[PDB]
C-alpha cells in the first residue's frame, strides 16, 4: 500500500494545474503549477483580519495546515517544512525533516504553540511555533493529523488493525495520551471520482477538532463523526451527528441529486461550516464559493416516511421533536463534559449549555404530549424520567391533567418528590 500526502479538505489537480492544499474555517490555500515551480496563494474568509498574500514555491509543497496565527507547509518527498506566520512581526522558519528510505511525510499540523509532522514510518516530530524540537516519537504509520492548542488528533494505519486513532496532549512537561490507537469506525471507500481516491485513498475529506475541542472526522461516506466521552477511555463513542447526503436530499425537495456535494471545513457547536460544490466532481473548484452553514441533524430521518408527510421537505412535528431531543441530549452531554474538565473557551458555553438544556426539555415535552394524546401512560412516564429541569416536570403534570390521566399524574409526582428528597441530602 502507498501512503498519500494528506491535508485537511485538500483537492487534487485533476485535469488542471491548480488545486487546494488545505481548507478550513480560517481560509483556503491553493497552489498553481507555474512552468517548473508553483504559486501558492493563502486566502482568508475574514478579509478584515488578515491580508491575502501569495509567494513562489520553489520546492513543490503538497502538505499544508492553516490556523489563525500562521500557515504550515510541507514537502512529502524532500521532507522540508516552512511555517509562515500571518503577521509580519514573526519571522518565517524552515527545517528539513530526516526521511529514511521510502519514508514520506504524510500529514502536518500546526497550532499557535505546536508544529506537528507525521511520516509514513510512524515518526511523530513535534516543535514549538518557532522550530525548537521537543521530542521525536515512533508510533504506527500516520495518515492524518490535526491539532488544537496543545492537543493532537492523529489517524494511523497498518495492515493489521486497519484505521486507528490516537488522541494526545502535548503539555509543557511531557506528552500524555487520552486514547492510544483505538478503533476508528470511519467508512472506507468502496468512476468519475477516481482522481480523488487516488489522491486520498482513505476518503478522509477532512478531520478537525470542534470549536469546543472534540475530535471530528469526515470520511467518504459524507457523515460527520464526533468523538464523545474521549476523556473517559471506557466510555469513548464515535457518534454520527450529520448525514450531509440526507440534508441535501431534504433541502432539495426529496429529489436525488448527483451534482450537489459537501466539503467540510470545521464544526462550530452545532453548525458545519462547509463548501457547497455543484458539478460532476465531489471536490470544490476555482473560484471557491462562499462557505455555507449546515446545522447538524441526528440520522433519525427515514426517506420513505418523509415522502408520505409531504403528500423543501416538510418534517412531521412528532418526528422533528424526537430528533431535537436526541440532538440536544448529545450536544448537552458533550458541552457539559467540556465545562466540567476544561472550562470555557469562547465565553458563551455556559449560555449555550443553558439554552441547550432548555431545548432538550421542550422537545422532550412535545413527545410527552403526543404520548398523552395516544393514551400511552407507560411511554409518557419513561419520557418524564428523562426530563432535566424541575420546571419541566411541573409542566408534564399540567399536560397530564389536560389529558385527564390522573394515574400518570401521581407517578410523575413521585419523581418530583424523589428529586426533592435528594435535595434534602
Amino acid at each position: 500500500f502507498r501512503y498519500m500526502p494528506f491535508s485537511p479538505a485538500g483537492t487534487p489537480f485533476g485535469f488542471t494545474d491548480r488545486r487546494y492544499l488545505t481548507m478550513n474555517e480560517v481560509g483556503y490555500v491553493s497552489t498553481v503549477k507555474n512552468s517548473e515551480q508553483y504559486s501558492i496563494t493563502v486566502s482568508f474568509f475574514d478579509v478584515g483580519r488578515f491580508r491575502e498574500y501569495h509567494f513562489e514555491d520553489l520546492f513543490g509543497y503538497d502538505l499544508c495546515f492553516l490556523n489563525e496565527k500562521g500557515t504550515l507547509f510541507g514537502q512529502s518527498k524532500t521532507g522540508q517544512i516552512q511555517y509562515r506566520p500571518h503577521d509580519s512581526i514573526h519571522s518565517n522558519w524552515t527545517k528539513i525533516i530526516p526521511l529514511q528510505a521510502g519514508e514520506r511525510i504524510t500529514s502536518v499540523a500546526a497550532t499557535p504553540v505546536r508544529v506537528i509532522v507525521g511520516t509514513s514510518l510512524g515518526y511523530f516530530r513535534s516543535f514549538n511555533q518557532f522550530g525548537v524540537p521537543f521530542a521525536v516519537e515512533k508510533t504506527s504509520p500516520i495518515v492524518a493529523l490535526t491539532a488544537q492548542n496543545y492537543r493532537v488528533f492523529s489517524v494511523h494505519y497498518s495492515q493489521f488493525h486497519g484505521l486507528s486513532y490516537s488522541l494526545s496532549e502535548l503539555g509543557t512537561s511531557s506528552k500524555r495520551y487520552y486514547k492510544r490507537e483505538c478503533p476508528l469506525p470511519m467508512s472506507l471507500p468502496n468512476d468519475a471520482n477516481l482522481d480523488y481516491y487516488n489522491f486520498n485513498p482513505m476518503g478522509i475529506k477532512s478531520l478537525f477538532f470542534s470549536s469546543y475541542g472534540d475530535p471530528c472526522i469526515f470520511g467518504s461516506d459524507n457523515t460527520l463523526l464526533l468523538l464523545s466521552k474521549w476523556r473517559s477511555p471506557e466510555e469513548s463513542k464515535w457518534l454520527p451527528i450529520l448525514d450531509s447526503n440526507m440534508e441535501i436530499w431534504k433541502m432539495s425537495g426529496g429529489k436525488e441529486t448527483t451534482d450537489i456535494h459537501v466539503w467540510p471545513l470545521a464544526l462550530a457547536y452545532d453548525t458545519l461550516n462547509c463548501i457547497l460544490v455543484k458539478g460532476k466532481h465531489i471536490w470544490p473548484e476555482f473560484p471557491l464559493p462562499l462557505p455555507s452553514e449546515m446545522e447538524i441533524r441526528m440520522p433519525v430521518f427515514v426517506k420513505s416516511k418523509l415522502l408520505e408527510e409531504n403528500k423543501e421537505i416538510q418534517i412531521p412535528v412528532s418526528m422533528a421533536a424526537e430528533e431535537e431531543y436526541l440532538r440536544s441530549k448529545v450536544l448537552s452531554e458533550l458541552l457539559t463534559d467540556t465545562l466540567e474538565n476544561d472550562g470555557e473557551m469562547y465565553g458563551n458555553e455556559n449560555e449555550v449549555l443553558a439554552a441547550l438544556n432548555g431545548a432538550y426539555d421542550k422537545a422532550l415535552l412535545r413527545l410527552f404530549a403526543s404520548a398523552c394524546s395516544d393514551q400511552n401512560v407507560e411511554k409518557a412516564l419513561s419520557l418524564a424520567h428523562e426530563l432535566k429541569q424541575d420546571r419541566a416536570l411541573t409542566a408534564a403534570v399540567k399536560i397530564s391533567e389536560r389529558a385527564e390521566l390522573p394515574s400518570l399524574v401521581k407517578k410523575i409526582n413521585n419523581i418530583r418528590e424523589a428529586r426533592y428528597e435528594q435535595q434534602l441530602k
Binding site: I248, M251, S252, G253, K255, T257, D259, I260, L276, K278, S292, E293, M294, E295, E312
Partner: peptide
C-alpha cells in the same frame, strides 16, 4: 435559512 436558499438555487 441561507443554506436552504443556496441548495434551492443549486437544486435545479
Amino acid at each position: 435559512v441561507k443554506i436552504q436558499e443556496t441548495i434551492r438555487k443549486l437544486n435545479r
